[PDB]
Each structure stands twice: as C-alpha cells, then as structure tokens.
Amino acid sequence: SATFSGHGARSLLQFLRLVGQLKRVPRTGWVYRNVQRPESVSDHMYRMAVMAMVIKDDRLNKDRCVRLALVHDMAECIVGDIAPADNIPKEEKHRREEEAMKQITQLLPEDLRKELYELWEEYETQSSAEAKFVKQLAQCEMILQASEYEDLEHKPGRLQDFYDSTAGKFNHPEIVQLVSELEAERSTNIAAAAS
Amino acid sequence: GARSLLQFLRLVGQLKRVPRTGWVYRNVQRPESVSDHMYRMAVMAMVIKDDRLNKDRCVRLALVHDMAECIVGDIAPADNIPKEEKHRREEEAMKQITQLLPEDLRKELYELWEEYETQSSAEAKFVKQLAQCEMILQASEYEDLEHKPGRLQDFYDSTAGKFNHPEIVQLVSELEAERSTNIAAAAS
Numbered sequence: 116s117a118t119f120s121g122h123g124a125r126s127l128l129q130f131l132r133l134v135g136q137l138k139r140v141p142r143t144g145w146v147y148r149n150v151q152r153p154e155s156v157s158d159h160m161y162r163m164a165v166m167a168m169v170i171k172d173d174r175l176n177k178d179r180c181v182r183l184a185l186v187h188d189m190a191e192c193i194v195g196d197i198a199p200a201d202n203i204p205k206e207e208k209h210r211r212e213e214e215a216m217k218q219i220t221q222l223l224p225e226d227l228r229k230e231l232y233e234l235w236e237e238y239e240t241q242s243s244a245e246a247k248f249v250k251q252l253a254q255c256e257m258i259l260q261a262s263e264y265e266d267l268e269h270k271p272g273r274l275q276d277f278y279d280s281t282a283g284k285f286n287h288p289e290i291v292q293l294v295s296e297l298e299a300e301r302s303t304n305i306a307a308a309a310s
Numbered sequence: 311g312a313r314s315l316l317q318f319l320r321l322v323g324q325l326k327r328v329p330r331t332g333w334v335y336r337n338v339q340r341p342e343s344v345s346d347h348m349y350r351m352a353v354m355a356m357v358i359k360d361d362r363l364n365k366d367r368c369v370r371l372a373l374v375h376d377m378a379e380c381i382v383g384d385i386a387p388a389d390n391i392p393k394e395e396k397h398r399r400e401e402e403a404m405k406q407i408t409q410l411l412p413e414d415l416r417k418e419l420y421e422l423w424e425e426y427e428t429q430s431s432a433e434a435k436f437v438k439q440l441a442q443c444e445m446i447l448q449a450s451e452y453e454d455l456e457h458k459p460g461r462l463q464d465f466y467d468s469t470a471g472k473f474n475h476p477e478i479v480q481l482v483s484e485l486e487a488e489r490s491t492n493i494a495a496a497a498s
Contacts, residue, residue, distance in 0.1 A: 124480050124481055124483070124484035125484055125488075127357065127358075127481060127484075128447075128481060128484050128485055128488070130357065131350070131353075131354065131357075131447060132447075132451065134350055134353050135350055135447070135448065135451055137349070137350075138342050138343075138346040138349075138350070139340075152327075154326050154343075155326075155342075155343070155346055157345070157346045157349040157350065158326040158343055158345045158346060158349070160349055161325070161326075161345035161346070161348055161349040161352075161373070162319070162322055162323060162325075162326070162345065164349075164352065164369075164373055165319075165322050165373060166319065168370065168373070168415075168419075169315065169318065169319075169411060169415055169419075170315070178366040178369075181366070181369060181370070181373075182356065182366075182369070185349070185352055185353055185356070185369075223357060224359075227356075227357050230356075231356070231357075259316075259319060259320075259323070260323065263320065263323055292312050293312050293315060293316065295312075296312035296313055296315075296316055297316055300313075300316070
C-alpha cells in the first residue's frame, strides 16, 4: 500500500473531508487579481457539471462528461490551485497532482479508486472527446465568471487578461457559439461604459 | 438561444453567491455556497454504494435539487416560511430558470427538481439522505476549524432518526462516533 488507512467507513469519511477542502480552496486566478470573495474550486466544478448537462453534443457520453467535470480539479484539495503566475513547470504540476490523486483515491474501495483515478487520467491526458469537451467547458466557465466579476465590480474590461489567455483555445461548435455571444455582450457593456 | 443559454448560466452562477443560510445564522465565518453543498453531494452520489440505484441520475438530482435558490435564496427553518409557500416560490423559480433552455432540457431539469421535491423515487430519497449527511459533515468540519467542538449540535439534533439508507447510516455512525470522541475529550 501507500499508507494503511484501510477502505472502510473511516477512510470514506476522510475522503469526503478531503473533497470538502475544495470548498476552502479559492480559485487562485481571481485571488491574484484582487477579486473580493472569490469562488471556490468546487463552485467552478459545480457550474461546469451543469454546463455538461445543458450544452449539447449527441456524440458525447454526457454522464461521463459530468463525472470528468466533478473529478478533474479534485487534486487541488491537496495541491491547492496552481495558477500560471506560480511558475510551476507542467511536469512538476502533473507530478504533484498525480501523487495527490493517488493519495485521495486510495481511501476508496478498489472499484471506486479505479473509476475516479481513471476519470482523472482521462482528463489529464485529454484522451477522449469527452475530456476535450470538458476542458473547453472549464475555459468557458472561467471567462463567464470573469465577466461576472467585472459586472459585480462595475469595472468592465478589468479582467481582460483571462479573455486573452483563451485565444485559439475554443473549437467545440456549441461552446464557440456560447463564447462568441458572451464576448459580444461583454464588449457591448465595455463600450456602453466608455460613453 | 445562446443568449438564453448564457442567461441560464448566469442564474446558475448566482448559486456561488448564495451562502448556506444555516451557517450564516450561526455566525460561521466565510460559509460555504449552495453550489459548494451540491458539489460535494454529487461526489457523494458517486462514492456511496447502492447497486440498485441509477447513480448518474442521483448525480443530476444532487446538482439540480437546490437550483431554484438562485432566485429564491436559501430559505432556512429560522426564516419561518410555510412549506407550501417555499414550494410555491421554488416551483415558480424553476419554471423561470428552465424556460431558458430548449424544450428537451427544460423538461429534464424541471422533472429532476420535481422528482426531488416530491421524493418520488428511490434515487430522490437517497439524495435527500446525502443532503442531510453532507450537512452534518460540514457542521463537524466548521466545529473543527473553529476549535469549538459541539458548537453546531443543533444540526445533529435535527437529523436524529432521519437516516435509513444502510451505507449512509454507516457513514453517519462513523462521523458521530469520531465527533463524539472529540466532544468527550473536550468535555474532560
């Protein structure tokens, strides 16, 4: 084993406590931009999961998309939310999160360890159409939230850096249309504020 | 279309800014959001065993059941809102929220909410037990974080006898034993 915490009720409860730490990991991107009361990582995954339900693609297993949305950032309960500004090399971030996912999932019975760990791997390696879709949900959810913070602050355009970072990251036809609509509305508000 | 979908998602996003009222009224610092609560419930649906249940349906129930709160807010027992009035408000809200979706999705999400509201399936009953379990777990977590063991006992008292799912009963028993050991320790 790694540790010897067993696969009974005590470890299931501890798994749930670790998952609960996600409520107390603020999303670092917003922290570093001085957003007041920023969302948690679980807030972020929650809306992604709903987005997987309501943004259509008949070619995808949406049950799997929902599960991927709910599991993909789970390592952050241990690792925290590493942002670009933290300058952690991709390989190191991978190593930390993989080791964390091993620690987290080993608290579960073998069948559930396997499922959750394999969901995480599917997302990390972007090995499926479902994974690639969910990654675009993540980026879309982020820029939507950016626009929402700008609106709440009455500072249109303040969080432009987030939009710039999503350049050429979108290709799913439904998400592309959602993003175009979002950027149009936002840009309308920016222009309206300018006059 | 995309515009209405965006409007729907902004409404859903409001859940991030609805604090769970039970904790607010107990002076918890930085209390969890309603979406925080549904998030962990959804993960619980995945990891708490029941081979008789449609688990992905349980996941969706967890993610939809409190969704009306984006318009209604999180009504707590201390708010003294009659059951019928709360139901009326949340039903009206869900109709408003879901009407922003295309037909098939409007129907699905509304029917999920309704299934949980009316507790009309084994899945709904399971998810209601997840909700209560998630709540008392969070109560003990705040007690631990505050270093005020037992402070939120009222939440435990409110769930007394409300658990009957065998796996959830096991988890709850473990939780209460660990917590009571902590309280007993503090009491000495």
